[PDB]
Design a protein around this ligand. Structure first.
Ligand SMILES: O=S(=O)(O)c1ccc(/N=N/c2ccc(/N=N/c3c(O)c(S(=O)(=O)O)cc4cc(S(=O)(=O)O)ccc34)c(S(=O)(=O)O)c2)cc1
Ligand SMILES: O=S(=O)(O)c1ccc(/N=N/c2ccc(/N=N/c3c(O)c(S(=O)(=O)O)cc4cc(S(=O)(=O)O)ccc34)c(S(=O)(=O)O)c2)cc1
Ligand SMILES: [K+]
Ligand SMILES: [K+]
Ligand SMILES: [K+]
Ligand SMILES: [K+]
Lengths: 499, 394, 394, 499
């Protein structure tokens, strides 16, 4: 069929029968930190709770953590726990009188020189980045205050100071943030504060990290060292925020466990129309790598204070799903907004609509056609299981995979049914929450044994699919698991009748 | 190749070598009515001037008409002129004010009507009867505004010459998420029909009074193009806006990015796989000419069509190059401004002769393509005429 | 890839690395009846011994039966035993002599019947009722001999376990050129049904009394295999012939060349594209196992099937490697000798246990493949059991 | 669709509606040299008359030529005229008593030494090939008398003499022919007799040559020189007769205008089962090169004296057509047989049946898929015209091509309708007779003018298709021709209604 052929046969009035495959990441804050409010989130469709370590102390976050664990255990939900780092920031200094008026056609001196720190004026002020004169060059741009103030660099005046053309009127106040479009920003992967944050996260047993401002594969390697041997199983989702991150996306994808497309930050740097396309490129490379991709910022922002978003906003969410994103993320809408439950429920309705309006077989065929023949046994088995789901119209795909690898591999092939992953580890259950289509179920091997014949895990997976309404008796399921000899990957498939 | 494989191989920082295929409708009002303001719009990327008959008098819009013709003649451009009806309100197809505005438009040589609040196929027939015999060559673009229009879309497409997706109107009745999917349905049914489709309302609204739009609005525009729309339309942004030229140039730049980001071969294959066998000679000749554009990597497709019909038919199949249409009618030049990929070029038969052996019209299409930097000597073009040719440009 | 691209890339002087998939039926008579002559046939490539009940008495054929079992036991081989009925002559399905010969065959443990002069589906039901309850597991291969059999082939295939294309009989009634095309139709309908098809009569007739056949006869044999036949059958060449061993070895060599010259993936795709969606679990598992053989380039497919059903079902899909079938029944070993690609291996459950976890039968299939030089440690195999596995041979 | 899907839907009782696309080459001789008998041949389905210059003088052949021209002109037929060369032969000498009995396990001495010419015996006899001891080596084989006598070379005795093992009983008589399997046979492309034959052929205006025993591309080049500037437009069809010809088939195809698969000769040299496959390989390489391929010898041999062939024979003809051959050839069946008209008519019935039982779209798709993209304009136009024929179900394809190149290019794409070729040259009409699907029609430009607008040739082509029953008014035809600027290839297509 094709996406076109799918479109002309949709009826937008028919009820949707699909089960929601995309996953919703929610940022926690004042509107949602309480145990009751977390319960609301989870009931409304939250699969991952994000802690924004730009704001708050460790105890603030500790309370998010403890409250999330009480609420989840009460509901019997597995909910991913994400730590989103502050990252290194480029800020200005102070200004006599707390701010300066700058007018287009003004020139201004920008100095990385510490002695102008707290005495900025309209003629000259401080900017924290020591490699200022090195990284930025006649003709390049410095953007300040969420990119509204645009400066074009005329010249280098001394090693400390650049002369700059003011592109637009702006009132600049103490400590605003700066961006350097198209530049190689010589800043560490992880700040000093980040290490300590990461160390907290490891101790508290987070599931994943959202690593800010990832620009090179080597920096992902730095995040990996900072988590250490103790955090070696924590996922690193690299946040792509600038041109350099988009340039190096291949090395960054290969080094990371997933990607976050941070559209707001990308937009300070890059024209809005190229951000739309960067989002597509990034999500698609992630789809082909079989690694989760999260779409973030500027989601349903207006629903932070209004009881409804604009249509342009709802279309931006849907098209994240149509581009292929595994996840969509809420920020202030859940953290400080007035409508945290409704935004999440609405986000989940948008996801359902997009999923139903997508021709899922076409994504399966696209991915499949990119495999080299001969395929490895592992790839052959997952792709063949997904095909089977299409051929017999099975209603769930059950994967026995302890680490979740094998659930991320089926999901990459995009079956049109839910994927159940039976795993011996709770951390896998929580880590699977960013992967499209997947519901993990925990197999307690301490209590029920090693299950060498896989029979208790196959029954558990089938039970999980019955409880969720995915299957009834007489429906088919496709099962993927290891034999009695292979370790590392399931090399074995069954097509079973639900009983 | 697939959209998926196209996306992974894109470089967003490479310069774009494509030539903009999507077309931009602009609403004319106080910001844009003067001769010099229309010149700027046309330079900025306007292909169609819309007159919103919900507001102003006949004499108001007469000024638009007269200034548009002055501005377009001066630049050498063929610009479609559209009359967008008030429609009825709180129903009949056309109100009494509508009958009068349509009679005026017929009298003033309009190209097309945007008919408000089309709910059924029979209603499109009433607009047609209202344009009558004298308005029989004016195009009707039915505006889809409510659930019933969405429901009756197959019959309304069959009866109309095109469709306008009025997102803001639909969103009063239908939840936002179903307007998003209704847009997809309407655009793709009109792609399969071979008929122009215009995306309207809520485009870059914020640029009415700000110098830059939000990314979400930029994404909504790119999405209209990805969905398959021929045209995007501007309302207040150009009618009342503070930055009319800038919002047009910007809407142009978005279209071009979306276009470069699209795997056009996928659209072509998908349209082609829907064709009944055996095809009519007409379908076969146009799909096969487009197929040849892909096979020999031609850099332009040239259609000789006096009515513009076979230009629309080639455009349906989505070649990944510009379509030049040599026509003996100015009115066809204006009417093709809503058709994706087409640059019309007028062949003056009075001046140059009847051209039975098509040779002069072929040389005109080729020089038109050279003039625009679409081709240079040694490139390939595919030519369709009343017949197909594959030629080297010299 | 296509048959066309396979042919241009073939090298006829390269050694063949394929393992012979097609199967050879031999008629037993005076040239071939002794224990030592049957040993030679079996070594030469016989998979099925045919007894032509048009001639000789019960006691004559009893000797064949007893000598075949002695010879096969000695070599360790499972050889199908077939009873080919006289049929009626100048009509009923089965004559009186037929009822008696069938009763004898049922009593002697035959594998399959070749039922002469099948004209309708109802006639196949009469042969079935004549084998009765005691002969309910004997296969009926309906011999197609006239225009009516050809006409009623869909119903006759549905009712039978297989078909025999009796070219010489068909050629009495139907022009030679329509027998050529009727052969194509019957073979391809049985390929699509998943049921064995035997090509018979006029195979290498001239080798009855000469040491070499003509090229035209060699071509007719290769053609049967290209058409899609599971099996080729020898009559007088082995029954009365001067060179029985040589005609078998030669028929084997022809099959192997035709096989090497066939693009097997094309047959697989063509069969697979006929499948209704949704498939049954059984169709899905076998096509998908064969698909995997092509995807990972496995060197053998192993089916655990006690009845041989899923071995026939995998064979339908035409993998380009050997199919090993581990079965708990000798009778299934004998019955699979008419099924393209299959080497059956007997799993002695009495000796080795019930094997619920399939492990011993899997190790048996793998060692069977090693023993025949189909695989070596490090190759891939695909295993189907009551479930699919892709395994490295160790 | 596929060939399989085509097969299961055939009814072999339905009348055939197709028009015969394959072409029948007939060898002329005593049964068929008369003007009346040529007329019978032509009426029965002959498209090419072959002269076998192994037998007969120039005047014998002159009479074939003059009689063929009278019969064809009387019928208004274009009939190809082929000269099939003798070629160099390897013969034995004489034997005392006119022949020797040789028994398996005998050894015998074979000598290329002239002085044993006329005095052969059971112990030693003469064989004409001076490079005997050089070309054939311990372990190689010499085959004699249409390959029934097999000798295995034990050793070289002197420069002149090989010692040989007799593989089988045989009675050997004066002058029998010898073959050297798997050998590089050091013999000229063209004998002395061949040159003179070729010279006759050029003078008499033959259409094509069947060149015997072509083993290398360089030898085709030698045939080309021997025809000369005067014969530069005569087609060379290379006869492939041994292993070396099959080894070098690529260079030979590229140098020749077509191929003849000479199955009988191949069979002396190569096991019968490998001949079947060589035939497939050769025909398919020819199909992809868009050059005619003729299948020859051992066709319906038994119908030389019997009023009907065996089924094995009829199947061998059909499968030449199914392999893709443009032509099938009769030899003694028409030259000396008792049933020359019936064999030809029957051969044409077999061709019809095979054509109808072939899925022609599958050959079109196979050929098409072997083109590199970007295609040249010429290839794009022919393949696109053939596609059009399939898409609109046109009933003829009309190609305006003076040299016939463009008719050979459509035919390669295998449309399921007849191809009409309008050409300004009678020699093209006669040369097109070996090309599948094609009926040429002569456009007399001397009389009707240059037809710069192509309109008289398009009408002529349509008239030709009406006269032959291919089209009626309201049917469609696809037309391929040049514009007012392109020379060398038609770059222009029309789809027209027949009126
Ligand atoms: O939604 S959209 O954005 O697309 C959109 C569509 C239509 C729109 N219509 N806008 C207008 C603007 C002016 C206008 N009439 N002005 C005048 C007037 O009314 C009178 S009167 O005495 O009271 O009659 C005397 C005047 C004397 C002079 S002057 O002496 O030369 O200075 C100049 C003008 C007027 C009219 S309308 O003709 O009344 O309809 C309509 C706007 C937006
Ligand atoms: O078409 S196919 O090529 O597949 C095909 C199918 C079946 C075919 N059947 N061939 C035969 C051969 C012999 C034969 N009976 N022989 C004997 C016999 O008859 C008598 S009796 O006194 O007259 O009864 C006494 C004998 C004493 C001795 S001895 O004392 O040990 O030397 C040995 C033999 C016989 C029979 S049958 O049993 O009569 O039917 C059938 C052949 C070909
Ligand atoms: K953060
Ligand atoms: K309006
Ligand atoms: K019989
Ligand atoms: K000859």
């Amino acid at each position: 069929m094709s996406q076109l052929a799918h479109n002309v046969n949709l009826s937008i009035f028919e009820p949707i029968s699909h089960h929601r495959a995309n996953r919703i990441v929610c940022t926690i804050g004042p509107s949602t930190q309480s145990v009751e409010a977390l319960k609301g989130l989870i009931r409304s469709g939250m699969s991952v709770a994000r802690m924004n370590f730009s704001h708050g102390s460790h105890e603030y976050h500790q309370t998010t953590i403890n409250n999330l664990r009480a609420a989840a255990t009460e509901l019997g939900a597995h909910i991913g726990l994400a730590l989103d780092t502050k990252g290194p920031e480029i800020r200005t200094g102070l200004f006599k009188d707390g701010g300066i008026a700058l007018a287009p056609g003004d020139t201004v001196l920008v100095t990385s020189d510490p002695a102008f720190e707290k005495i900025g004026t309209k003629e000259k002020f401080y900017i924290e980045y020591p490699r200022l004169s090195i990284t930025v060059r006649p003709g390049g741009f410095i953007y300040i205050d969420d990119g509204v103030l645009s400066l074009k660099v005329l010249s280098k005046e001394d090693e400390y100071t650049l002369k700059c053309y003011v592109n637009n009127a702006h009132f600049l106040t103490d400590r605003k943030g700066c961006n350097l479009p198209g530049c190689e920003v010589d800043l560490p992967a992880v700040s000093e504060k980040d290490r300590e944050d990461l160390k907290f996260g490891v101790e508290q047993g987070i599931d994943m990290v959202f690593a800010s401002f990832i620009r090179t594969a080597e920096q992902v390697q730095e995040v990996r060292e900072a988590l250490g041997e103790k955090g070696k199983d924590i996922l690193i989702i690299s946040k792509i925020e600038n041109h350099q991150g988009v340039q190096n996306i291949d090395g960054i994808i290969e080094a990371s466990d997933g990607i976050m497309v941070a559209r707001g930050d990308l937009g300070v740097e890059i024209p809005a129309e190229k951000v739309v396309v960067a989002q597509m490129i990034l999500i698609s490379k992630c789809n082909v790598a079989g690694k989760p991709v999260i779409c973030a910022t500027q989601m349903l922002e207006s629903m932070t204070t209004n009881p409804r978003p604009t249509r342009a906003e709802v279309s931006d969410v849907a098209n994240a799903v149509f581009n292929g994103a595994d996840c969509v993320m809420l920020s202030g809408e859940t953290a400080k907004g007035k409508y945290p439950n409704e935004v999440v429920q609405y986000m989940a309705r948008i996801c359902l609509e997009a999923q139903s309006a997508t021709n899922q077989a076409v994504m399966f065929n696209s991915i499949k056609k990119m495999q080299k023949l001969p395929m490895s046994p592992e790839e052959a088995v997952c792709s063949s299981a997904v095909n089977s789901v299409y051929e017999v119209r099975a209603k769930a795909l059950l994967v026995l995979s302890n680490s979740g690898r094998s659930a991320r591999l089926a999901s990459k092939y995009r079956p049109d049914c839910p994927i159940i992953c039976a795993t011996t580890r709770m951390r896998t259950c929580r880590q699977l929450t960013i992967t499209r289509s997947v519901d993990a179920v925990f197999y307690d091997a301490e209590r029920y044994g090693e299950d060498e014949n896989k029979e208790k895990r196959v029954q558990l997976g089938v039970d999980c699919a019955k409880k969720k309404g995915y299957v009834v008796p007489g429906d088919l399921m496709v099962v993927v698991h290891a034999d009695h000899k292979v370790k590392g990957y399931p090399n074995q498939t069954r097509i079973i009748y639900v009983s």
